[PDB]
Design a protein around this nucleic acid. Sequence first.
DNA 1: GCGATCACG
DNA 2: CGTACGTGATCGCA
Length: 580
Amino acid sequence: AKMAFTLADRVTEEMLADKAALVVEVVEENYHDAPIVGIAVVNEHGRFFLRPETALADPQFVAWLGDETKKKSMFDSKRAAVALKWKGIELCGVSFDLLLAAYLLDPAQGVDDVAAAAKMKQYEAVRPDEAVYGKGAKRAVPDEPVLAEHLVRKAAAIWELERPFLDELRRNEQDRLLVELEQPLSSILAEMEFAGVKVDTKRLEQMGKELAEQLGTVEQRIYELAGQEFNINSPKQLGVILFEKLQLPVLKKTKTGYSTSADVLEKLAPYHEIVENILHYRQLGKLQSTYIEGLLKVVRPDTKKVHTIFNQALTQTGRLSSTEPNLQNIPIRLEEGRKIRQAFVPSESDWLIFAADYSQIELRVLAHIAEDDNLMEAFRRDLDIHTKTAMDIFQVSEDEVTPNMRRQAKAVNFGIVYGISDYGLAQNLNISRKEAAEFIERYFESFPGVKRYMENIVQEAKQKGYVTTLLHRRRYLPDITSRNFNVRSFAERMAMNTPIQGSAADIIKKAMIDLNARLKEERLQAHLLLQVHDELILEAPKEEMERLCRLVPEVMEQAVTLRVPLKVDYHYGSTWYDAK
DNA sequence: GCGATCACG
DNA sequence: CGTACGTGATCGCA
Ligand SMILES: OC[C@H]1O[C@@](CO)(O[C@H]2O[C@H](CO)[C@@H](O)[C@H](O)[C@H]2O)[C@@H](O)[C@@H]1O
Ligand SMILES: OC[C@H]1O[C@@](CO)(O[C@H]2O[C@H](CO)[C@@H](O)[C@H](O)[C@H]2O)[C@@H](O)[C@@H]1O
Ligand SMILES: [Mg+2]
């Protein structure tokens, strides 16, 4: 059953045809400055395996790789593109990426290797990467014979599956989504990841020392209030101290003991001083372990930069995710944590950080898709949406809206985007289901368009079996027909939320593509560093700030045309912290 | 490995 | 009749 191929000792013309399935294997999960263990090429002339040191040293092969007119079909082209960037080699002409194709066809399949993608089309003549390389620590690159056949089988699968995948994407009206959106975006994310973000390690270490002292102080205070020393991080021990020694009320338990989540502690705070200290300890410990020590662990010792990897084929809604490190969840909500951002600085002298963010893109998207007259008018007047929602549901004028009213109206708006339910809103606001139901009823009386939309999208999910986004991203919801209330409700909330969060993802992704095109046309040095769901962070010479202030918001606001305007705010400064 | 926890939009 | 939507990293413990 073995697959025939040529284990070449050198590159030949036959291997450089204008169309081929290409495999540039990088086994390390984190591909930054990582080894390329082998190369496979499958084209009209046959199947070939090439040793990396050989192929990458061949001028003809390198030229072929960078020739945009020589088309390549691959799986996870970003991985190869980045690994090649670290070697100073440009990869061009990728016309088809099987990973992105599989992802668009069905995000829920969780495709993360050629074998999983091929299985979708009943093609199984290729092994899963885990089977070949192993997992965790027992992982390793096989001997050449085994490695070579595997890479060739992967290239062969890609060669065979391109057409079937493209045909189905076409039937789904997702052909442009792959070719004009996700694939071009992949190249942009590759540049962003490769550029990396500079870190002021001296700043982080200083913060780490100050946090260590404060943690010591709070730690001693906790032992003092508990009447003894114990492992504050030990659930078993903390549980005994709080709910047994100190007799605090037990409101929530886990599959092993008592729950001490912030949500629980906040309600226990009034009963004992030790609680606020535990919450504070939690806050500092989180910053220290995850954002100081953790971050320092992945900073490149030579350049002092961090190179995240944006997983473009993971989320069920079309969003990106970020890892090692995750640069999409750096603190900002609480001032003490926000300081962490002072450690993220420009990569060059006299450059600055520029951040642009969409204002209420999810609710604006909702106004558009639901075609709700009241909601669309609200955004056309660029009103404070939470104050406006409070005015409508509580039947009062703007001057009569109290802070508590805006807060609750805001919670209602979050629930609306998440997939509203009386139980969900009730838990969030700490009110009764009946009271929550009333808020929801009032909301729908004021936004009948949204109500009709939520009713219709759930019905559509049942009829078609999936929901879609503005640019035709898809998410199947088989549980929408479940006869189990909890299971079905999960699916219903997904039907309501996915088109909103997903369309917002579509919009910013297109904005990124449009932005890079504009930056190149203007030959600006400014470039993207990060994307945080509804915001874009760039760095650029101080001399380019004025032009960026006009260019970035415009490009983001014009990415797509909706029934309501899109609004973008922006800030810039010496550090990410200051870009506010 | 996995549940609890908490960081972000 | 009971979960708010979407993610990732760290730590304690089986
Ligand atoms: O290269 C990113 C791409 O690879 C997948 C597997 O096909 O994920 C791998 O790489 C990630 C980044 O290092 C890891 O977080 C993940 O654990 C590893 O399997 C895809 O999911 C992703 O799109
Ligand atoms: O009472 C109708 C109302 O209930 C929802 C759930 O909030 O859907 C339920 O009723 C539908 C029939 O009207 C079913 O198709 C659906 O499976 C069931 O959960 C809303 O979508 C609907 O407006
Ligand atoms: Mg914003």
